[PDB]
């Protein structure tokens, strides 16, 4: 047997905590995905810049 009121209260509290943690994880995961995307773009543009400079130094 259990405490019926106690397991109802714990059910509700767990659902609340789970939703809050889900929202926190979804927000953090989206921030990290956007960060990874931005970093990937940066690395592509950096590659192009390195290529421009090595072309310049080569033509010298």
């Amino acid at each position: 047997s259990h405490d019926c009121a106690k397991v109802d209260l714990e059910n509700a509290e767990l659902r609340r905590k789970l939703i809050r943690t889900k929202r926190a994880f979804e927000d953090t995961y989206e921030k990290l995905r956007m960060a990874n995307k931005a970093k990937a773009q940066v690395e592509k543009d950096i590659k192009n810049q390195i290529l421009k400079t090595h072309n310049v130094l080569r033509n010298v």
Partner: protein, 51 residues
């Protein structure tokens, strides 16, 4: 007497020396222009990474 002859030769060698010095000087300026423009572009790019 005949001093005009050799002096013309020395002046023509000097002309070739101005041609060489000015030629390599302009080539160096073109190089410096390309390198400067590339440094400005790259500095602008690096600045763009801070936004």
């Amino acid at each position: 007497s005949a001093v005009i002859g050799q002096l013309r030769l020395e002046l023509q060698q000097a002309r070739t020396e101005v041609e060489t010095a000015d030629k390599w000087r302009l080539e160096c300026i073109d190089v410096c222009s390309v390198l400067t423009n590339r440094l400005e572009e790259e500095a602008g790019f690096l600045n763009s990474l801070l936004k």
